[PDB]
Amino acid sequence: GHMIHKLADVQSKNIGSGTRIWQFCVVLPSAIIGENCNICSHCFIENDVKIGNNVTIKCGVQIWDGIEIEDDVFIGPNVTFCNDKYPRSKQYPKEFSKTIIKKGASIGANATILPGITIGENAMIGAGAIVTKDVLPHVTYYSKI
Amino acid sequence: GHMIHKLADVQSKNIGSGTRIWQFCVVLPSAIIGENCNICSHCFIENDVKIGNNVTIKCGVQIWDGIEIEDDVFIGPNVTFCNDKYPRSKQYPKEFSKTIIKKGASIGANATILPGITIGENAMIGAGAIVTKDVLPHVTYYSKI
Amino acid sequence: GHMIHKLADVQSKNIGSGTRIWQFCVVLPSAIIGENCNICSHCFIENDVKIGNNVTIKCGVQIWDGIEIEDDVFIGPNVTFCNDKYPRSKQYPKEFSKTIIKKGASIGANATILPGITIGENAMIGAGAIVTKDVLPHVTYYSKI
Numbered sequence: 001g002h003m004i005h006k007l008a009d010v011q012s013k014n015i016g017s018g019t020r021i022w023q024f025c026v027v028l029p030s031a032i033i034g035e036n037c038n039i040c041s042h043c044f045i046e047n048d049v050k051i052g053n054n055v056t057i058k059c060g061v062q063i064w065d066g067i068e069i070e071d072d073v074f075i076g077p078n079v080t081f082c083n084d085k086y087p088r089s090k091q092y093p094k095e096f097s098k099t100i101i102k103k104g105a106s107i108g109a110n111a112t113i114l115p116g117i118t119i120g121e122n123a124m125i126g127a128g129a130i131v132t133k134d135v136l137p138h139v140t141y142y143s144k145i
Numbered sequence: 146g147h148m149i150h151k152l153a154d155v156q157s158k159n160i161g162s163g164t165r166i167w168q169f170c171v172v173l174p175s176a177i178i179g180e181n182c183n184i185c186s187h188c189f190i191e192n193d194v195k196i197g198n199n200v201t202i203k204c205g206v207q208i209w210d211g212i213e214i215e216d217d218v219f220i221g222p223n224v225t226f227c228n229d230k231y232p233r234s235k236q237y238p239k240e241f242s243k244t245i246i247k248k249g250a251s252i253g254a255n256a257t258i259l260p261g262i263t264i265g266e267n268a269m270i271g272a273g274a275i276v277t278k279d280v281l282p283h284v285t286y287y288s289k290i
Numbered sequence: 291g292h293m294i295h296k297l298a299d300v301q302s303k304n305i306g307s308g309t310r311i312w313q314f315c316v317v318l319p320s321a322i323i324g325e326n327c328n329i330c331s332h333c334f335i336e337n338d339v340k341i342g343n344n345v346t347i348k349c350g351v352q353i354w355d356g357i358e359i360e361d362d363v364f365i366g367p368n369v370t371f372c373n374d375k376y377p378r379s380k381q382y383p384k385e386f387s388k389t390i391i392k393k394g395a396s397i398g399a400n401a402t403i404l405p406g407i408t409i410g411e412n413a414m415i416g417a418g419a420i421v422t423k424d425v426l427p428h429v430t431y432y433s434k435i
C-alpha cells in the first residue's frame with residue numbers, strides 16, 4: 001500500500017507501493033507516481049505527469065503538465081518548473097513544452113527550470129540555479145554569483 | 146458565481162464571477178479579486194490588495210498589503226513579492242511600499258519582485274529574475290547567468 | 291497561551307506564549323518555538339529545529355532538521371534552507387549540516403541559504419540572494435545582477 005495524508009487532496013489512483021504523500025498536497029487524477037516516492041508537504045502535481053520510483057520531492061514544488069521525473073531523482077524544496085516559455089494569461093498553448101529530469105539527477109533547493117529542459121542522468125543542479133539550457137549527464141551546474 | 150474550493154480559507158466577499166480559488170489558499174477579508182481569475186493552490190492574498198480581471202496566479206504566490214495586479218496579468222509559480230525594503234522582525238512600517246503589475250504583464254516562475262516596483266503593461270519577466278528596478282512597458286527583463 | 295490555526299497540523303507542544311501559527315503549516319513534534327513568533331501560512335518546520343523569541347517566518351518557508359533561528363530574526367517569504375550539500379534520493383546523511391541564523395538577522399524574500407551556513411547577528415540578506423558562504427554580523431549581502 002501507499003500513505004496519503006488525510007490533509008492531502010490526492011485524486012490519482014496511479015500511486016506505487018511505499019509512496020508517501022504529505023499534508024496539503026494536490027495530485028490530479030492522471031498523475032502517475034511510482035513506488036517508494038516521498039511527496040513532501042505543499043506540492044502540486046498536475047495530470048500529464050509521470051514520476052518514477054524512489055523519487056524525493058521536497059516541500060513547495062509543482063510538477064506541471066508536460067513534466068516527467070525518472071527514477072531516483074531528488075527535487076529540492078521550492079524548486080520551480082515551467083511548461084510555457086512566453087506565458088500570457090488565458091493564452092493556452094496548443095502543446096505544453098516538455099521537461100524531463102533523468103534517472104538519479106538532483107535539483108538543488110529553489111532552483112528554477114525553464115520549459116523544454118532535459119537534465120541528464122545523475123546531474124547535480126546547485127541551489128538557487130536558473131537552468132535555461134539542458135544539463136548533460138553527471139554534470140554539476142550552478143548559477144555563479 | 147465564483148468557485149472557492151472547500152480546502153481554501155477565503156474571507157473576502159469581493160470576488161468576481163468566473164474566478165476560481167483553489168486548495169490551501171488564504172484570502173483575507175479586504176482583498177478585491179476581479180472576474181475570471183485563477184488563484185492556484187497554495188497562495189496567500191492579504192487585505193490591502195487589488196487584483197483585476199482575467200488574472201492568473203500560479204501556485205505558491207503571496208500577494209501582500211500594498212500590491213496591485215491589473216487585468217490580464219500572469220504571475221508564475223513561486224513568484225515572490227515584497228512590501229518592506231529593510232525588514233526587521235516586529236518593526237512594522239508606518240506605510241507599506243506599493244508594487245503595481247500593469248495590465249497584461251507576465252512574471253516568470255520563481256522571480257523575486259523588490260518592494261516599490263512598477264512592472265509596465267505587457268512586460269515579460271524571465272523565470273528566476275530579481276527585479277530591483279521598474280520594468281518598462283513591453284520589455285523582456287531577465288537576470289543574466 | 292499561543293494561537294494554532296485549526297487548518298495547521300502542529301504536533302509540537304514546545305511553543306511559547308504569544309506565538310501564532312497560521313493555516314496549512316506543519317510543525318513536527320520536537321520543534322521548539324519561542325514566544326511572540328509569527329509562523330505564516332504554508333510553512334513546514336521539522337523536528338531538530340530551534341526557533342527563538344519574536345521570530346517572523348513569512349509564508350512558504352521550510353525549516354529543516356539542523357537549522358536554528360535565534361531571537362528577533364525575520365525570514366522572508368519563500369526563503370529556502372538546505373541541510374544536505376550533495377543530495378541524492380534515499381541517501382540519508384549520517385549527520386545533517388547545521389545552519390544558524392543569529393539574533394536580529396533578516397533574510398529577504400526568496401533567498402536561498404546553502405547548508406552549513408552562519409548568518410551573523412543583524413545581517414541583511416537581499417531578496418533572491420544565494421548565500422553560499424557565511425555572512426558576517428551586520429553585513430548587507432545580495433547576489434548582484
Ligand SMILES: CC(C)(COP(=O)(O)OP(=O)(O)OC[C@H]1O[C@@H](n2cnc3c(N)ncnc32)[C@H](O)[C@@H]1OP(=O)(O)O)[C@@H](O)C(=O)NCCC(=O)NCCSO
Binds near residue numbers: 128
Ligand atoms: C552545487 C554544489 C553541489 C557545489 O558544491 P561544491 O562543488 O562542493 O562547490 P564548492 O567548493 O562549495 O563551491 C565552489 C564555488 O562555487 C560556488 N557555488 C557553490 N554552489 C553554488 C550555488 N548553488 N550557486 C552559486 N554558486 C555556488 C561557491 O560559492 C564557490 O565559489 P568560489 O570558488 O568563488 O569560492 C552545492 O553548493 C549545492 O548547491 N548543493 C545543493 C544543496 C541543496 O540544494 N540541497 C537540497 C536541499 S537540502 O536536501
Ligand SMILES: CC(C)(COP(=O)(O)OP(=O)(O)OC[C@H]1O[C@@H](n2cnc3c(N)ncnc32)[C@H](O)[C@@H]1OP(=O)(O)O)[C@@H](O)C(=O)NCCC(=O)NCCSO
Binds near residue numbers: 087130
Ligand atoms: C525570458 C524569456 C521569455 C526569454 O526567452 P527568449 O527571449 O526566447 O530568449 P532565449 O533566446 O531563450 O535566450 C536568450 C539568452 O537569454 C538567456 N535567458 C533566457 N531566459 C532567461 C532567464 N529567465 N534567466 C536568465 N537567462 C535567461 C538564455 O540563456 C540565452 O542566453 P545565451 O544568449 O547566452 O544563449 C524566457 O526564457 C523565460 O524566462 N520565460 C518565462 C518562463 C516562465 O517562467 N513561465 C511561467 C511558468 S510556465 O507557465
Ligand SMILES: CC(C)(COP(=O)(O)OP(=O)(O)OC[C@H]1O[C@@H](n2cnc3c(N)ncnc32)[C@H](O)[C@@H]1OP(=O)(O)O)[C@@H](O)C(=O)NCCC(=O)NCCSO
Binds near residue numbers: 417419
Ligand atoms: C538588499 C537591500 C536591503 C539593499 O537596499 P539598499 O542597500 O537601499 O540598496 P539600493 O541602493 O536599493 O541598491 C544598490 C544596488 O544594489 C542592487 N540591489 C539591491 N538589492 C538587491 C538584491 N536583493 N539583489 C540584487 N541586487 C540588488 C540595486 O539594483 C542597486 O544596483 P545599482 O547600484 O547597480 O543601481 C534591498 O534591496 C533588499 O533586497 N531588501 C529585502 C527586501 C525583502 O526581501 N523584504 C522581505 C519581504 S517584504 O517584508
Ligand SMILES: Cc1cn([C@H]2C[C@H](O)[C@@H](COP(=O)(O)OP(=O)(O)O[C@H]3O[C@H](C)[C@H](O)[C@H](N)[C@H]3O)O2)c(=O)[nH]c1=O
Binds near residue numbers: 040316378383
Ligand atoms: C512526518 C512528515 C514528513 N514530511 C516530509 C518532509 C520531511 O522532511 C520528510 C521526511 O522524510 P525522509 O526522512 O524520507 O526525508 P526525505 O524527504 O527523503 O529528505 C531527507 O533526505 C534527503 C536525502 C535530503 O538530505 C533531505 N534534505 C532530507 O530532508 O517527509 C512531511 O511533509 N510531513 C510530515 O508530517
Ligand SMILES: Cc1cn([C@H]2C[C@H](O)[C@@H](COP(=O)(O)OP(=O)(O)O[C@H]3O[C@H](C)[C@H](O)[C@H](N)[C@H]3O)O2)c(=O)[nH]c1=O
Binds near residue numbers: 064
Ligand atoms: C483542478 C485544479 C487546478 N488548479 C490550478 C493549477 C492548475 O495548473 C490550473 C489549471 O487551470 P488552467 O488550465 O486555467 O491553467 P492556468 O492557471 O491558466 O495556467 C496554464 O495556462 C497558462 C497560459 C500557462 O501555460 C500555465 N503554465 C498553465 O499552467 O488550476 C489547482 O490549483 N487545483 C486543482 O485542483
Ligand SMILES: Cc1cn([C@H]2C[C@H](O)[C@@H](COP(=O)(O)OP(=O)(O)O[C@H]3O[C@H](C)[C@H](O)[C@H](N)[C@H]3O)O2)c(=O)[nH]c1=O
Binds near residue numbers: 209228234237312331
Ligand atoms: C490573518 C492571517 C495572517 N497570517 C500571516 C501572514 C500575514 O502577512 C501576517 C500578518 O501578521 P503581522 O502584521 O504580525 O505581520 P508580520 O508577519 O510580522 O510581517 C509584516 O511585518 C514585517 C515587519 C514586514 O514588513 C512584512 N513584510 C509584513 O508582512 O500573518 C496568515 O498567514 N494567515 C492569516 O490568516
Ligand code: NA
Binds near residue numbers: 110223255368400
Ligand atoms: Na522560490
